[PDB]
């Protein structure tokens, strides 16, 4: 329901070293933290955020007693993030000249979590560390750190200027900070971080060590505080004597802005003084006001109109049996084309929680469907007031879970029967062998996947499904800019936004000559209007 | 638009049509009346923006404006309506025959050339632009016009110049006593490809079953959603059209209308200040959002500007193999992309080459999609789509690209971790047997929307004042009895194998 996140960000002089052509790690970390706080503020989440800075000239933390945990300051305690914090991050925080231990800073941040969590209910206690690891650190408290983190159930994430593993481009899909300028101090810090992540979780923490450039194009900062959607309990019924208790979750559901643009007066900026109204007038000339209750519902039947009142429509309306998830039959997976998928959501169907019998039954159904290469055509109705749907429930087997994925299928009325002229049989639109070869070269050059050597797995060079929606970040940036500078125009789109939205520079460079061949071989001329 | 559709119903009013061969069947006149009733209902449900008319020949009275004899134009070329349906229902079978005989004559002589002239000028009267000019002729004899070869030849020339004009004259093999006797007048009076109706046709009906089969659908015509520009780069640009081959059909919205006089009432919404009461221009308002205790004020143009990323069109990001497109990553219904030579020449050629190479290499063109101005872009994949023809050589899958939307990072929801409980091979085999028992062949048009069907039935019943609306059969329901009979003890065996005798 509510999480406590502490952002432990480095400030020391080391990150101020700006390699030409590359933004400094201080600026990159500032951008990442601004990205996190912008969403946490404009999404109206109840999570409380604290900010701890280490490497500053001053000292302010409840652990300093003279020559320990120095150069570490607690800029912000656990409270709801706000525009004050956003402004502090944007302008009032300046790089320091001292150096601090990223482990002493972790001690301070864990102390903040422990001594400010009391008196409040937190389901999660997350913490994120932004540092370059290019500082001398005392590795004498690792056991205490790991034990306290395990006991207090505190997560961890690490963000570094370089990724774990052309010109550098922030937020792009390509190589990060080059793997040649890493000092031995940074190597020691990196191996310590690797050991810490290993000890806290297992094997998958190596995936929880990110770089600023790749974190700017991912939702990884919100991964440990994301809230899981509510389940939809029902029963998967086959016939009238076989029922399996299930729980369905929405896999893909397009996210939209929750806040709405209120219309206010241009002078008093209040919505109270501005209110709308509806006017009912006759369609012919001499428009006369019609009373609100003097209007009844109607419908079109060809060239005529018939009255059909609300109560009569409710009485004569199609009445559904109720909530259901019922199998109408099984068909081959090849007969359900992906191009016919309807609806605006995707449901993943799991067995009921803490139900081993239901889990076994659903696993048997999933395995049978997978082995037979068949899918289930089911009747789905969210509730008794919901329009029933027909859809496909195909198996989805992974290494850690199994489920049925439900996607709505079209009705007879949804299909459009459109005739399109054949392209292969066309004589005036037949490409020549030279044009075909040029297009072939273009396809080869613009490949977005790399076939790994010695392995039969394809690596995606542009995984767009992991890129967050740029509209939310753009809206948050514009809102923050207007809040901080009320009398200035909106800023342009951010370069790293454009970079994550753009394809890799390697692909762009490789696609040069084939595109020239396409241009010189395909005579595209615009028709005069 | 490509024009509307026009249909003229030509019904003979001879004395021979009013008799019935047997007594358990339906007389030809009212059977054709039911045919026209079904056509009106189907057109109102599907294609209400068409023109339908009914004209009778072989009668005594006449109402055609051009003033020829023995021809009654009951209905003009106009949109179908419940009033016309009831008017023609006035002549339905029992007592319908008597009212027909009382209001117009029957058994009188008629001229086919005269009738065709009436149909031609009746088509010419309406000023709308129509794609098809079709007339359906209802009769079951050819004797009266075979007596006078002069008028037979005149009728043949009338059919000829109607065919030259573009009149698509149909023939309806109606219930005949001893056969229709085709291949004398009605074989060469019509426009046909070849002698399909080469038999004597002793049967009473030829296409009346599919003429009575009602059409309950919206029946939308082809129209490109947007004529965008596919941009390989900033220089190579082609123009494509975006179509929705699938679109969720909606129940038509209710219309507000005055109570007693029953005419539509248009709605206008105006915004005015509480204090002064005067109308406010769009420049007199600003958009506001409040977060906590801070108010953020933006202009409408600013709010539209913050949503602007790219110009409308498709920008080719690159080509990605089809194996990387996960099936369970569906976001919203896909669209269809087809070339458009009316905007850029060579677009069809480049589109064909791209489609051929993508199909050969099994790769999908990843593109950045901006439907219109001031809208955030989405990443879409142009999955190549090969043309598919069935045994009848008709097109069932058009050739082109399937514009499929790809979800963003925040369009996907994470899920609570579960325990992967495995199923034993015997349980898997038992469910395999169950699945094999309940196997069936699925087609995209196998199911109908029960809500829409019930709404259409209710509307038809209310408009036609039927005694009770006939209930639609919900084909989207599990045939539980058939399933149980087909399965038998398999379900019990599976329950014994899986469920402990407590759950």
């Amino acid at each position: 329901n509510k999480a406590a996140v502490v952002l432990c960000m480095d400030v020391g002089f080391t990150m101020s070293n700006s390699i030409p052509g590359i933004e400094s790690p201080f600026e990159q970390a500032k951008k990442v933290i601004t990205m996190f706080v912008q969403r946490q503020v404009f999404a109206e989440n109840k999570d409380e955020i604290a900010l701890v800075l280490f490497g500053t000239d001053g000292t302010d933390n409840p652990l300093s007693g003279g020559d320990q945990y120095q150069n570490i300051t607690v800029h912000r305690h656990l409270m709801l993030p706000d525009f004050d914090l956003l402004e502090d991050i944007e302008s009032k925080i300046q790089p320091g000249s001292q150096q601090a231990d990223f482990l002493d800073a972790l001690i301070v941040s864990m102390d903040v979590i422990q001594h400010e969590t009391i008196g409040k209910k937190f389901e999660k206690r997350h913490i994120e560390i932004f540092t370059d690891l290019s500082s001398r650190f005392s590795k004498s408290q690792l056991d205490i750190i790991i034990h306290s983190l395990k006991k207090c159930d505190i997560s961890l994430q690490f963000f570094l200027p370089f990724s774990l593993g052309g010109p550098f481009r922030l937020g792009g899909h390509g190589p990060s900070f080059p793997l040649k300028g890493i000092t031995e101090q940074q190597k020691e810090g990196l191996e310590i971080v690797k050991m810490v992540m290993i000890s806290l979780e297992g094997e998958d923490g190596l995936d929880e060590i990110y770089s600023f450039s790749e974190s700017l194009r991912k939702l990884c900062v919100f991964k440990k505080i994301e809230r899981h959607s509510i389940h939809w309990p029902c029963r998967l019924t086959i016939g009238s004597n076989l029922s399996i208790r299930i729980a369905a979750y929405k896999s893909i559901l397009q996210e939209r802005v929750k806040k709405t643009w209120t219309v206010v007066d241009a002078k008093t900026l209040k919505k109270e003084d501005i209110q709308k109204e509806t006017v009912y007038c006759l369609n012919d000339d001499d428009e006369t006001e019609v009373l609100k209750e003097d209007i009844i519902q109607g419908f079109r039947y060809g060239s005529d109109i018939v009255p059909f009142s609300k109560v009569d429509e409710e009485q004569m309306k199609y009445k559904s049996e109720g909530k259901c998830f019922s199998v109408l039959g099984f068909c081959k997976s090849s007969q359900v084309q992906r191009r016919f998928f309807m609806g605006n959501q995707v449901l993943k169907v799991f067995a009921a929680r803490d139900d081993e019998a239901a889990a076994v039954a659903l696993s048997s159904l999933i395995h049978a469907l997978d082995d037979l290469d068949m899918v289930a055509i089911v009747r789905y109705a969210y509730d008794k007031r919901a329009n029933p749907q027909v859809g496909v429930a195909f198996p989805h087997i992974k290494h850690n879970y199994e489920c049925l994925v439900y996607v709505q299928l079209p009705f007879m009325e949804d299909l459009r029967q459109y005739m399109f002229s054949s392209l292969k049989n066309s004589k005036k639109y037949a490409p020549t062998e030279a044009q075909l070869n040029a297009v072939d070269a273009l396809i080869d050059s613009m490949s977005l996947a790399k076939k790994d050597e010695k392995t039969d797995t394809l690596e995606d060079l542009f995984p767009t499904t992991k890129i967050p929606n740029p509209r939310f970040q753009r809206l948050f940036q514009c809102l923050l800019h207007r809040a901080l500078h009320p009398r200035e125009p909106l800023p342009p789109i951010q370069q790293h936004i454009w970079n994550m939205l753009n394809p890799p520079a390697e692909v762009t460079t490789k696609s040069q000559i084939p595109l020239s061949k396409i241009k010189t071989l395909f005579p595209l001329i615009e028709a005069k209007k | 638009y490509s024009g509307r559709d026009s249909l003229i119903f030509l019904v003979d009013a001879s004395k021979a049509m009013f008799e019935s061969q047997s007594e358990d069947e339906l007389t030809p006149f009212d059977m054709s009346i039911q045919c026209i009733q079904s056509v009106y209902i189907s057109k109102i449900i599907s294609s209400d923006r068409d023109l339908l008319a009914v004209v009778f020949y072989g009668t005594e009275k006449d109402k055609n404006s051009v003033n020829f004899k023995n021809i009654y134009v009951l209905q003009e070329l106009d949109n179908p309506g419940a009033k016309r349906i009831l008017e023609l229902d006035q002549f339905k079978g029992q007592q319908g025959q008597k009212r027909f005989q009382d209001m117009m004559g029957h058994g009188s002589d008629y001229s086919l050339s005269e009738v065709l002239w009436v149909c031609a000028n009746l088509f010419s009267d309406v000023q709308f632009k129509m794609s098809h000019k079709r007339i359906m002729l209802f009769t079951n004899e050819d004797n009266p016009h075979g007596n006078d070869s002069a008028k037979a030849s005149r009728a043949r020339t009338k059919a000829g110049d109607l065919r030259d004009t573009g009149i698509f004259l149909d023939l309806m093999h109606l219930k005949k006593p001893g056969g229709f006797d085709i291949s004398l007048f009605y074989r060469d009076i019509i426009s046909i490809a070849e002698d399909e109706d080469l038999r004597v046709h002793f049967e009473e009906s030829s296409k009346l079953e599919d003429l009575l089969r009602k059409v309950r659908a919206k029946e939308t015509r082809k129209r490109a959603l947007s004529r965008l520009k596919l941009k390989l780069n900033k220089d190579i640009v082609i123009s494509v059209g975006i179509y929705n081959l699938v679109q969720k059909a909606l129940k038509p919205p209710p219309i507000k209308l005055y109570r007693e006089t029953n005419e539509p009432v248009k709605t206008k919404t105006r915004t005015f200040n509480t204090s002064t009461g005067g109308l406010l221009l769009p420049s007199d308002t600003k958009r506001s959002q409040i977060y906590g205790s801070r108010q953020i004020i933006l202009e409408k143009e600013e709010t539209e500007e913050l949503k602007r990323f790219d110009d409308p069109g498709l920008m080719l990001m690159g080509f990605k193999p089809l194996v990387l497109l996960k099936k369970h990553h569906y976001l919203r219904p896909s669209l269809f992309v087809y070339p458009e030579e009316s905007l850029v020449i060579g677009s069809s050629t480049l589109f064909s080459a791209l489609l051929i190479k993508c199909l050969e290499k099994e790769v999908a063109a990843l593109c950045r999609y901006t439907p219109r101005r001031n809208i955030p872009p989405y990443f879409v994949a142009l999955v190549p789509q090969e043309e598919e023809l069935d045994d009848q050589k008709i097109q069932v899958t058009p050739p082109g690209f399937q514009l499929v939307f790809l979800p963003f990072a925040d369009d996907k929801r994470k899920m609570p971790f579960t325990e992967k409980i495995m199923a034993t091979p015997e349980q898997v085999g038992k469910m395999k047997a169950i699945v094999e028992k309940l196997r069936f062949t699925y087609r995209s048009d196998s199911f109908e929307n029960p809500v829409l069907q019930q709404h259409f039935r209710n509307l038809e019943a209310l408009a036609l004042d039927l005694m009770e609306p006939e209930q639609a059969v919900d084909l989207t329901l599990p045939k539980v009895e058939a399933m149980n009979k087909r399965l038998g003890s398999l379900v019990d065996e599976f329950k014994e194998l899986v469920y402990p005798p407590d759950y």
């Binding site: 109408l328 029967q417 | 559709d5 009848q392 008709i394 199911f447 084909l475 989207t476 045939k479």
Partner: peptide
């Protein structure tokens, strides 16, 4: 034209739904 609706020309005839028919 084969497989053409007699009610709305230009569009193929709609086969009746039928529903689920087990093999």
């Amino acid at each position: 034209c084969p497989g053409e609706s007699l009610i709305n020309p230009g569009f193929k005839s709609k086969k009746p739904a039928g529903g689920v028919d087990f093999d």
